[PDB]
Amino acid sequence: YNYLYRLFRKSNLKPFERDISTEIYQAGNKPCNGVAGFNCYFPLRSYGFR
Amino acid sequence: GWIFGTTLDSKTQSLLIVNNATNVVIKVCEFQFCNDPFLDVYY
Numbered sequence: 001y002n003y004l005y006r007l008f009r010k011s012n013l014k015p016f017e018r019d020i021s022t023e024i025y026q027a028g029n030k031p032c033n034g035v036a037g038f039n040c041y042f043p044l045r046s047y048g049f050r
Numbered sequence: 051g052w053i054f055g056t057t058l059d060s061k062t063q064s065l066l067i068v069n070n071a072t073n074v075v076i077k078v079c080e081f082q083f084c085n086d087p088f089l090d091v092y093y
């Protein structure tokens with residue numbers, strides 16, 4: 001689970017662009033305010049690699 | 051010099067160009083400096 005990928009807020013990356021920000025991803029109307037709840041989750045996900 | 055970025059805070063990389071009397075340093079770092087930035091004339 002060392003390798004991680006990204007899920008943005010419907011914003012495609014530019015050519016040769018790299019992001020490091022780990023803010024909580026929001027999918028709903030309410031703000032996440034740092035709490036991963038309903039329609040709010042951490043955008044960095046780990047591979048299985050078994 | 052100049053600062054370039056989206057939010058210019060600790061959560062985003064920002065580009066900084068400093069041209070003092072000897073050389074130019076360009077650093078792409080996420081360190082957050084104060085708004086309305088200043089440079090000291092004398093040490």
Ligand SMILES: *[C@@H]1O[C@H](CO)[C@@H](O)[C@H](O)[C@H]1NC(C)=O
Pocket residue numbers: 011012013014017056
């Ligand atoms: C750069 O920032 C702007 C302002 O938030 C945003 O609209 C744009 O999608 C960003 N570009 C990316 C993430 O490639």
Ligand SMILES: *[C@@H]1O[C@H](CO)[C@@H](O)[C@H](O)[C@H]1NC(C)=O
Pocket residue numbers: 070071072073075
């Ligand atoms: C100018 O900046 C460079 C790099 O930060 C430093 O090495 C140098 O001593 C500075 N010169 C003066 C006169 O402040």
